[PDB]
Backbone:
């Protein structure tokens, strides 16, 4: 009965040269029992990408909540929300439920359309912002991901190289965690094109 | 026009006609007076004996607040009772928090702010009473008179009701003739006389005299009613002066 | 965490470490724990990271509105009073331990706020897990009538004591100097004595190393 | 309550639901239908806490029936599942949450596709080819992983379901008194009377 | 959550 | 007791007029002339400081108010109504935007929030409309410089340049002749002072004229250094001295 | 008490009319004309700006045409401020529906709820009604392209082509004359402008006094695109039809 | 005229017309007489019927074992005020194990009636009450008017032609006050008093309503054949 | 014409209830005057006690709001005391919340904002009072800030209020034309009080005894009113010059 | 914590240590546990620092607002306000406060308010953890109508012992003198009081 480790799952985001990458596993389980191998944890609102680990009912609820909020934002602002602004909206929204929180580990990723700067950010469950140049990690294999990212990562990787680094970081971390894996998805995000790749990984 | 139909409405003069109309209800009422003395205050009131069927001494109009304040009023008697009920709540909450019994100036503003509040809205009627009240606190004796508008001042002597001009004229003479001060026992006898003299403006029905007093020496700073020998002594003094 | 405040003759200086941790793991290697309440009122936070940011942001907002309403530059005692009344209301459930410092028309000020709503006054203060390491240095070296350059040295030395000796503290030293009659200067990453040594090897993978099942273009446009 | 299974095949969704209602050391009933029809082409099976199960099922049924009258239109299985999930998502942070786990088997008339949704009492929704709730999954999922094919007919789906019920009757500790089976397709909802 |  | 006025004091007349809005606009007409001119690289908002008494210190009374670091407001009509609107406008910029997005609202959205407050006084129970028209000048990263008028009704229009109050008819005709789409901020300030002289009768100097700009970022006015992204407020109130300098080359 | 000053906004005339609804409609009849024309392959929204000034910023302006979601837009006639209150409510109602059902709100449901809000102000609360008429132009996968109008009464009806605001009598006669069912969007665009051009109280119809929008399936394959026309785009479409 | 729209408005001469109109409702009401000695207090009420087929409107209500009133005017308002008195009498018993003083009863009615004369929306009570009771200070009779004015009397009468009974009691004052330890003789004096307020009609068996409270007598009402003794 | 009964606009865009509240200001027939020294702010008001039965010590239109702030009222005493109590409550709360003494100008704005609400909200009438706030602010120095029923407020070099306000105003105007400064160039508050009384005597054209005047004085860290003997001492000084 | 109030001939004297401890660590070694609620009404704070600070702030506001309306409050009035807060919120407060003030009529007065929220008017009071060790000493040594210098010595010697034995008490001895003359702050350093 630890909400953050019932369903299991991982998200990792990395920055490259004029690009960002966000990746997640596909497992949704009920403790030992694997239930779904299609449960994607990465969403997007325009060009801003959000990955959410933790309790799956809250992952779904927050996605629906941020879609709701980014839609009203766009109608009133007459423009798509930027990653830096969305990061603040996520933080505000999570801390609004400070004494009854969503059991989640969200990760914002995207490129500012005006400045062209790669941006990634992670949050705790109460909504504290963790901004990083290099990488953000989240989920049941966060320890493993921290170990993989910290050793594998190097700055200013090209989109095609960054893909290999983030993919090997997720895969090898997921294989040392019981509640993570069962398939993976990697988003490679450039200024005005986004490639989405499904990885082949061991299914145990 | 139509400026007088609603409370809290300014006329082009800058007047609240509904408050001035409430004053007419006070002017219509029986005579009530207050006399500030050396170490306390004395209250007296005219009680019109409408019928022989009225039980003497058993329709008390003067009211006590806390244990040290006396209140008397002319006009709509129920409105007066409502104001005293409020005064008792204000005095209780003051004692509860600050331990000390409420000072008279403090108490005066508690009524003043409340009566003034009934001139701020068209959903309430102004008070149909001028209230003469006071007592003894740590700073000595205080007499006050409060009007429908929420206007109140400290007084040496106060009078309101149908015989106010008669009573005021008689009060002004006491202030002039006793600059050093009037004693508590003297003020009780003068209070009786002034009610009897002010009864000339209400002389169709004969009346019943009622006197109370707070005095640091005589009543030990507490509010008490003047009854028995002291009351009959004051009545006899007043009866002698009219003749 | 290691946050300290030091008072000098013409101002106050606050410094903090740059390490944020979840359990024994380091979440943020270089996180700024110095917050702007107002242009000349700055605050260093320890305890629940989310709580310190949120409470600082909320009061920072209410101080700006108060400044506009009164047509006056905000005072440190206003920020302190608003903070400690808010923290007290929540009976310590908001885990914000702050060192509040700034300059205002009244002069230079240095306070500390605890989650339960208690406040301290001092010429030198230290909060967080590394406070005992920092306070040891402050107690050893602090004196009356410090200069600006001495106060910065003492403050950064007290943070360093935390960085080395406390496991909770590490990485870099952030400093903010609030001097009277001058703009406050925020010295982010004033000291970076924990630079990562060159790795023995590049782990840049040969392209195609990762096995891929599917590719697709994602539509971000309307 | 205990055993509720669901198998989406080519042209239909099949919901199996145990008939036993046990309280203490007494099987009170052996013919209980743990399902409500939400709309002509949408069926919901439910299992969990006593009282909560039926109270929740009927509440959802009423809301979907109200929508159907108001708009003179049947809500898609996707739309109904999303509505049900949100109700459970609200419920879990209530004073007393609904401890009800559901399978929603529906036929989308606009897409001409069967759809099976597995939603737990937390409000965790997933679209699956086959689903189960409680201990049933620990046996049936591995069995279906092996024997299930996506292009199976309704008759093949029922044989695959019989294989699940047989395995559960062999290895499950408790006597769940067999299952009521129902098929959701383009022609609506009908019950298999002999299983 | 995180601490400092 | 209690607010028994839970019904509208603004209703439609048979003709279709909303009396209390029309009468609020009449109150704005009586109000002192204020104007706004939009340049390529900034905005200027100006108004006469009608002194109630020569003993009164007209510096204490601010007709031109900062709402955000990058937004300013001026009015014509009833000053008290304006003052409470500025208080509400400043707070709503925080509560409904900055406390959510961690940045100040763009001009059009803050204007929209002010308009909403003034619209509610037009329909809510037991209240009269606000007796003011606002001119709100502001800058934001994605819209650039903008100027908006807000009427008692809650209606707002964007302007290149306009005037409101006493001599608005004559002031608008004057601005039409002088305004072009290539005006630099200094040229717009020059025209603002020319236009305002026509409506002003008595003294015309930096002490009787209140003028503010939305221009370049002012790092000197920020109050701190160290954060490169924070470059200071674009709103700046011209000093009594700065106005008098430009009145010599008039 | 306060009874003396109560207009009684929600009562019947002896004839059985709602005074405040009738007077709100009289208010809207003086507002700039707004036209909606529904074609087989899209909807046109045209609206005449109220007597424009030469110094009004035209490009960064929104008076008449507002976006409710990606599939629905409205043309406004009446008090702009009143309209914006109802638009923000409509925008939220659309997102509430999406959050609940994971499907974009059907047009009629959004229109009914907004109309039901207006109805409330005529029956209870003792407040003045919203001095606003809407033309709802939207698309859903049930009914396809739909035009609606709502008015202060809270009554709504569906249309093929409709006008609200000023000179609706003259505008509706001209639409009823030249409209037909097999009409294309580009034809509807021309009709909309020709109607405004004749019914306008102005000397000549120009780009700076017009707001224009189309809801086509003119995007790439089975998806709807909203186009709120830019000043230069209105200038081009006005020359293309030969009005200027 | 222009100043009788509601109770919150004073007239130019300082009158409350809504309170005066409420007072008028009492004058229209059927006569009821109150009188007491030192040992007993008596209510005598002339009950009124709609017609010969109708019952006679019950005028007398019991508040406690030692207190009760008679009414003249709006009977529903009398029910509200009597119910309030029952609660205040009952509160005194449960909390303080103390019978409520008849004087306090009057003060509580006065303050309840007053609040209705100073607030918008409300209306004055449209009924007069004669409260009798026996407490720790002997027998009592009160006259309540909906203006808020409560008066302690030896005897009185309210309703239509009440002036007849009130004049009689004013003459008889010295006689009936000293009817001590004799219930039947005090009632006779009350029945003779109400007879002075009769025109064309006389006191019958289902017409007359008598109540009594005293030293060793709980508040008890007499109707029907029980009052035949006194005709 | 019910647009004259409550605070809603007349056809010509006026609030008649605000205008009539202004006329209520002069109902007391009392003239007040405020001037600033270097170190102090002095406020003086006429004291008329017509009734001989009145206790003259209790007759006051000057109030001690906080330790630092003083307030004089032109208008009826009930509304005056209403305004005084609120101002005291506001000044106390400000100190508790924000940890420093409420400035004179900030209290004036707060009371003016309250006054504004009564002109916009129907159920509340405006108070028939003009509030003149005086202090020695720790930032701005000697301060005079005045509030009216309209909800208007502004700072003053000096000010006058009452029936014969215009005569006092022009008298003060002519002095500041001559002196060429924003204040009374005087060291002691005693002489600033003497100036205030002297210029009121010249403007009104009446002589004052000790019981005809009421004086308030604001210095740094306290505001205080002068007793009859304090004023009498002051009147003697003027006479002997 | 070690605090005490002593009533002497010319008024009252408040005395306290300066040590605030979290567990066995000293958070502040220069705390000012003597706080002003009015010009000549002061209190001594023991228990939860957060709770005692919050209470003290509320009373100062109450007595400031009291002064605006009714002039200077009595020391009894101040103690009554303290009691009202402490008694009504006894479930959520850990605060032992000694209220000490100087009237001109009543002279020096000391009221002690323990955890319960009860009020006890005494010739002198002691409270806080350190007090336990000096009940014997203070009882044997206290006399009524002492001089200023005697009362300062009595407090200095008393708190000196309290500090010597109590781990939770230490630092400097602060004192505040309340007389008709005015308000005088005194401080005494370890190097003096330790070797008494
Ligand atoms: Cl305010
Ligand atoms: Mg496995
Ligand atoms: Mg599940």
Residues:
């Amino acid at each position: 009965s630890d909400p953050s480790s019932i369903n299991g799952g991982i998200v990792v985001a990395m920055t490259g040269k004029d690009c960002v990458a966000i990746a997640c596993d596909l497992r949704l389980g009920s403790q030992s029992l694997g239930v779904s191998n299609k449960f994607e944890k990465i969403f997007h609102y325009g060009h801003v990408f959000l990955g959410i680990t933790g309790l799956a009912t809250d992952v779904t609820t927050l996605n629906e909540m941020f879609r709701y909020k980014t839609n009203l934002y766009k109608l009133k602002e007459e423009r798509a929300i930027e990653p830096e602004t969305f990061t603040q909206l996520v933080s505000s929204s999570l801390y609004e439920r400070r004494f009854g929180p969503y059991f989640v580990g969200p990760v914002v990723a995207g490129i500012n359309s005006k400045s062209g700067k790669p941006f990634i950010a992670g949050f705790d469950l109460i909504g504290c912002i963790d901004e990083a140049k290099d990488f953000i990690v989240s989920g049941t294999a966060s320890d493993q991901l921290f170990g993989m990212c910290e050793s594998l990562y190097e700055p200013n990787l090209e989109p095609e190289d960054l893909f290999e680094t983030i993919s090997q970081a997720l895969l090898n971390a997921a294989d040392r965690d019981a509640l993570s894996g069962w398939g993976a998805v990697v988003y490679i995000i450039k200024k005005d094109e986004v490639v989405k790749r499904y990885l082949k990984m061991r299914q145990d | 026009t139509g400026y007088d139909l609603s409370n809290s409405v300014f006329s082009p003069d800058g007047r609240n006609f509904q408050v001035e109309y409430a004053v007419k209800a006070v002017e219509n009422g029986t005579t009530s007076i207050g006399i500030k003395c050396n170490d306390g205050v004395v209250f007296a009131v005219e009680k019109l004996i409408t019928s022989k069927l009225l039980v003497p001494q058993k329709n008390v109009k003067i009211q006590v607040v806390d244990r040290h304040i006396g209140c008397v009023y002319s006009g709509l008697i129920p409105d007066g009772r409502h104001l005293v009920n409020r005064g008792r709540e204000e005095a209780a909450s003051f004692k509860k928090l600050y331990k000390t019994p409420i000072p008279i100036p403090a108490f005066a503003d508690r009524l003043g702010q409340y009566v003034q509040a009934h001139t701020l809205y068209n959903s309430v009627r102004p008070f149909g009473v001028s209230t003469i009240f006071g007592g003894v606190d740590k700073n000595g004796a205080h007499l006050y008179m409060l009007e429908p508008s929420g206007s109140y001042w400290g007084y040496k002597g106060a009078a309101t009701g149908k015989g106010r001009q008669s009573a005021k004229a008689e009060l002004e003479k006491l202030v002039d003739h006793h600059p050093e001060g009037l004693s508590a026992r003297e003020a009780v006898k003068q209070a009786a006389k002034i009610i009897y003299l002010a009864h000339e403006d209400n002389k169709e029905k004969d009346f019943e005299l009622e006197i109370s007093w707070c005095s640091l020496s005589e009543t030990n700073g507490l509010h008490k009613f003047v009854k028995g020998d002291l009351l009959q002594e004051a009545i006899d003094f007043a009866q002698k002066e009219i003749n | 965490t290691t946050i300290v405040g030091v008072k000098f003759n013409n101002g106050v200086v606050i410094a903090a470490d740059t390490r944020s941790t979840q359990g024994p793991i380091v979440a943020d290697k270089n996180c700024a724990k110095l917050h702007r309440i107002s242009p000349k009122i700055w605050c260093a936070g320890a305890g629940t990271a989310a709580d310190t940011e949120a409470v600082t942001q909320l009061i920072g907002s209410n101080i700006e509105l108060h400044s506009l309403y009164t047509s006056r530059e905000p005072r440190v005692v206003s920020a302190l009073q608003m903070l400690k009344q808010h923290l007290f209301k929540y009976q310590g459930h908001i885990g914000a331990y702050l060192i509040v410092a700034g300059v205002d028309p009244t002069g230079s000020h240095l306070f500390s706020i605890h989650a339960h709503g208690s406040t301290d006054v001092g010429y030198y203060l230290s909060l967080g897990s590394g406070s005992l390491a920092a306070m040891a240095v402050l107690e050893s070296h602090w004196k009356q009538d410090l200069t600006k350059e001495e106060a910065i040295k003492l403050a950064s030395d007290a943070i360093q004591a935390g960085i080395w000796n406390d496991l909770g503290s590490g990485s870099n030293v952030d400093v903010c100097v609030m001097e009277i009659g001058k703009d406050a200067e925020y010295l982010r990453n004033y000291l970076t004595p924990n630079v990562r040594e060159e790795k023995q090897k590049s782990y840049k993978f040969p392209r195609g190393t990762t096995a891929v099942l599917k590719e697709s273009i994602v539509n971000i446009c309307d | 309550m205990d055993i509720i299974l669901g198998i989406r095949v080519q042209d239909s969704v099949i919901l199996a639901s145990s008939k036993a209602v046990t309280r203490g050391i007494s099987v009170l009933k052996d013919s209980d239908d743990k399902t409500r029809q939400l709309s002509p082409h949408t069926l919901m099976s439910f299992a969990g806490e006593a009282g909560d199960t039926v109270q929740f099922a009927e509440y959802i049924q009423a809301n979907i029936q109200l929508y159907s009258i108001r708009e003179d239109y049947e809500l898609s299985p996707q739309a109904v599942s999303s509505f049900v999930r949100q109700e459970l998502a609200k419920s879990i942070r209530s004073r007393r949450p609904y401890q009800v786990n559901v399978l929603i088997g529906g036929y989308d008339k606009k897409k001409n596709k069967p759809e099976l949704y597995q939603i737990d009492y937390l409000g965790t929704k997933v679209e699956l080819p086959y689903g189960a709730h409680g201990y049933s999954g620990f046996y049936t999922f591995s069995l279906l992983d092996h024997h299930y094919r996506p292009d199976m007919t309704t008759e093949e789906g029922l044989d695959l379901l019989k294989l699940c019920v047989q395995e559960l009757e062999k290895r499950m500790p408790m006597d769940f008194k067999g299952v009521i089976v129902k098929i959701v397709d383009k022609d609506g909802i009908r019950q298999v009377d002999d299983f | 959550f995180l601490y400092x | 007791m209690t607010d028994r006025y839970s019904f509208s004091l603004t209703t439609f007349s048979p003709s279709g007029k909303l009396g209390q809005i029309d009468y609020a606009l009449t109150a704005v007409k009586q109000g002192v002339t204020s104007l706004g001119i939009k340049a390529t690289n900034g905005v200027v908002i100006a108004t006469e400081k009608k002194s109630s008494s020569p003993l009164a210190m007209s510096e204490t009374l601010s007709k031109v108010s900062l709402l955000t670091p990058d937004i300013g407001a001026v009015y014509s009509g009833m000053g008290p109504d304006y003052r409470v609107l500025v208080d509400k406008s400043r707070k709503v910029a925080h509560t409904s935007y900055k406390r959510i997005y961690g940045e100040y609202p763009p001009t059009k959205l803050l204007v929209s929030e002010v308009a909403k407050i003034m619209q509610e006084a037009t329909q809510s129970g037991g209240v009269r409309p606000f007796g003011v028209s606002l001119l709100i000048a502001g800058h934001d990263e994605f819209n650039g410089f903008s100027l908006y008028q807000v009427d008692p009704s809650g209606s707002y229009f964007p302007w290149k340049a306009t005037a409101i109050g006493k001599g608005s008819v004559a002031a608008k005709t004057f601005l039409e002749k002088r305004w072009n789409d290539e005006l630099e901020l200094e040229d717009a300030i020059h025209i603002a002072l020319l236009t305002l002289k026509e409506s002003v009768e008595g003294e015309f100097n930096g002490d009787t004229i209140e003028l503010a700009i939305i221009g370049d970022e002012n790092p000197d006015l920020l109050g701190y250094t160290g954060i490169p992204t924070d470059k200071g407020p674009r709103f700046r109130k011209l000093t009594s001295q700065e106005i008098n300098d430009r009145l010599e080359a008039l | 008490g306060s009874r003396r000053y109560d207009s009684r906004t929600t009562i019947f005339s002896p004839e059985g009319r709602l005074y405040q609804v009738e007077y709100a409609l009289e208010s809207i009849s003086h507002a700039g004309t707004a036209i909606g024309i529904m074609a087989s392959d899209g909807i046109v929204l045209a609206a005449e700006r109220k007597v424009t000034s030469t110094l009004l910023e035209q490009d960064t302006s929104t008076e008449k045409l507002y976006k409710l979601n990606d599939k629905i837009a409205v043309a406004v006639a009446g008090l702009t401020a009143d309209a914006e209150i109802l638009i923000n409510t409509a925008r939220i109602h659309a997102q509430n529906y999406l959050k609940t059902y994971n499907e974009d709100i059907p047009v009629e449901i959004l229109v009914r709820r907004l109309s039901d809000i207006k109805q409330g102000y005529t029956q209870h609360g003792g407040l003045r009604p919203f001095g606003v008429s809407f033309i709802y132009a939207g698309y859903d996968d049930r009914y396809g392209y739909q035009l609606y109008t709502s008015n202060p009464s809270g009554n709504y009806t569906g249309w093929k082509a409709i006008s609200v605001g000023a000179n609706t009598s003259a505008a509706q006669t001209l639409l009823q004359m030249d409209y037909k069912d097999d009409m294309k969007v580009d034809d509807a665009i021309e009709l909309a402008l020709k109607t405004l051009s004749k019914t306008t109280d102005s000397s000549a119809l120009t780009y700076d006094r017009l707001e224009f929008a189309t809801i086509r399936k003119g995007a790439n394959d089975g998806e709807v695109y909203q186009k709120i026309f830019k000043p230069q785009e209105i200038k081009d479409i006005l020359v293309k039809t030969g009005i200027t | 005229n222009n100043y009788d729209g509601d109770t919150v408005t004073f007239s130019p001469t300082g009158r409350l017309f809504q309170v005066e109109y409420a007072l008028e409702a009492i004058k229209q009401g059927s006569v009821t007489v109150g009188l007491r000695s030192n040992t007993h207090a008596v209510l005598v009420a002339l009950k009124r019927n709609a017609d010969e087929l109708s019952s006679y409107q019950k005028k007398i209500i019991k508040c406690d074992e030692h207190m009760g009133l008679s009414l003249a005017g709006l009977a529903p308002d009398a029910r509200v005020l009597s119910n309030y008195l029952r609660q205040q009498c009952n509160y005194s018993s449960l909390v303080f194990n103390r019978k409520l003083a008849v004087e306090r009863a009057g003060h509580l009615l006065c303050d309840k009636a007053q609040k209705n004369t100073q607030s918008y929306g409300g209306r004055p009570y449209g009924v007069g009450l004669l409260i009798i009771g026996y407490d720790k200070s002997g027998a009592h009779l009160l006259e309540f008017q909906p203006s808020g004015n409560v008066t302690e009397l030896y005897g009185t009468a309210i309703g239509a032609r009440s002036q007849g009974a009130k004049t009689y009691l004013e003459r008889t004052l010295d006689t009936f006050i000293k009817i001590d330890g004799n219930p039947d003789e005090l009632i006779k004096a009350g029945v003779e008093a109400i007879s002075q307020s009769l025109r064309d009609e006389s006191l019958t068996v289902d017409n007359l309503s008598i109540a009594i409270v005293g030293k060793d007598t709980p508040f008890t009402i007499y109707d029907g054949e029980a009052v035949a003794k006194y005709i | 014409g019910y647009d004259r009964h409550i605070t809603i606009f007349s056809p010509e865009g006026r609030l008649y209830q605000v205008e009539y509240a202004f006329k209520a200001t002069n109902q007391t027939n009392i003239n007040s005057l405020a001037v600033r020294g270097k170190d102090c702010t002095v406020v003086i008001s006429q004291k008329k006690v017509p009734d001989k039965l009145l206790d003259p010590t209790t007759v006051s239109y000057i109030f001690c709001i906080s330790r630092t702030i003083g307030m004089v009222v032109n208008g009826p005493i009930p509304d005056a005391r209403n305004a005084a109590l609120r101002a005291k409550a506001e000044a106390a709360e400000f100190r508790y919340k924000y940890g420093y003494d409420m400035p004179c100008d900030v209290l004036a704005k707060r009371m003016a904002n309250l006054s504004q609400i009564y002109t916009q909200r129907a159920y509340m009438r405006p108070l028939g009072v003009i509030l003149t706030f005086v202090s020695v602010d720790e930032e701005l120095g000697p301060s005079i800030y005045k509030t009216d029923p309209a909800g208007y407020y502004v700072g003053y070099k000096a000010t006058a209020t009452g029936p014969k306000q215009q005569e006092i105003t022009t008298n003060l105007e002519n002095h500041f034309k001559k002196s060429k400064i924003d204040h009374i160039n005087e060291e002691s508050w005693e002489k600033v009080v003497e100036f205030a009384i002297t210029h009121m005597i010249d403007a009104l054209g009446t002589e004052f005894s000790k019981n005809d005047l009421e004086v308030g004085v604001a210095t740094k860290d306290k505001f205080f009113t002068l007793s009859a003997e304090n004023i009498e001492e002051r009147l003697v000084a003027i006479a002997e010059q | 914590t070690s605090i005490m109030a002593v009533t002497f001939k010319d008024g009252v004297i408040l005395g306290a240590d300066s040590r605030t401890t979290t567990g066995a660590y000293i958070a502040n070694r220069v705390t000012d546990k003597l706080t002003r609620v009015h010009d000549k009404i002061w209190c001594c704070r023991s228990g939860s620092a957060a709770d005692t600070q919050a209470i003290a702030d509320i009373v100062q506001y109450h007595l400031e607002l009291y002064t605006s309306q009714y002039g200077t409050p009595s020391t009894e009035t101040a103690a009554s306000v303290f009691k009202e807060l402490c008694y009504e919120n006894k479930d959520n407060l850990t605060a032992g406060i000694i209220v000490a003030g100087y009237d001109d009529k009543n002279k020096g007065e000391v009221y002690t308010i323990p955890l319960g929220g009860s009020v006890h008017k005494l010739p002198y009071a002691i409270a806080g953890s350190g007090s336990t060790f000096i009940y014997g000493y203070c009882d044997k040594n206290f006399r009524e109508n002492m001089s200023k210098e005697e009362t300062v010595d009595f407090i200095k010697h008393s708190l000196s012992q309290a500090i010597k034995w109590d781990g939770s008490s230490g630092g400097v001895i602060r004192m505040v003198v309340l007389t008709a003359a005015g308000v005088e702050r005194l401080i005494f350093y370890p190097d003096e009081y330790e070797q008494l």
